[PDB]
Amino acid sequence: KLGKLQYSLDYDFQNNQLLVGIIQAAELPALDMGGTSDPYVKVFLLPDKKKKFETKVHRKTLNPVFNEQFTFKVPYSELGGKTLVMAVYDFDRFSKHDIIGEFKVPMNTVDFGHVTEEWRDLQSA
Numbered sequence: 001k002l003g004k005l006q007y008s009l010d011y012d013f014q015n016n017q018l019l020v021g022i023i024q025a026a027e028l029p030a031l032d033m034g035g036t037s038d039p040y041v042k043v044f045l046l047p048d049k050k051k052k053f054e055t056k057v058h059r060k061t062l063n064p065v066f067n068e069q070f071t072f073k074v075p076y077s078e079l080g081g082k083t084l085v086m087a088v089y090d091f092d093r094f095s096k097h098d099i100i101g102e103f104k105v106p107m108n109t110v111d112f113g114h115v116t117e118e119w120r121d122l123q124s125a
């Protein structure tokens with residue numbers, strides 16, 4: 001229904017940073033004339049809605065490849081109370097951007113001793 005996102009997670013102890021890798025999306029819904037969308041991904045760690053990143057916009061595709069990694073300065077021991085949000089939006093030059101769908105990861109469930117890379121279905125906000 002809302003597409004899928006492939007991402008990965010890691011933690012860098014040398015800089016005390018969470019690494020969020022945004023790989024690609026697939027089967028995104030079309031939101032623009034011509035049957036396509038202009039997707040990008042907004043990435044942030046709740047409850048800090050202020051520190052925020054966006055991938056580049058990939059215009060007129062429903063299957064964008066991003067290959068962008070973002071870093072969040074957060075102490076390892078405090079990660080547990082955070083929730084990572086990866087939200088795919090349709091870019092618009094002129095107006096407020098419409099959300100397509102999102103995936104959330106409660107950080108207390110992440111095992112940094114094993115692989116984290118995966119495809120996940122986007123959900124409505």
Ligand SMILES: [Pb+2]
Binds near residue numbers: 031090091
């Ligand atoms: Pb658009």
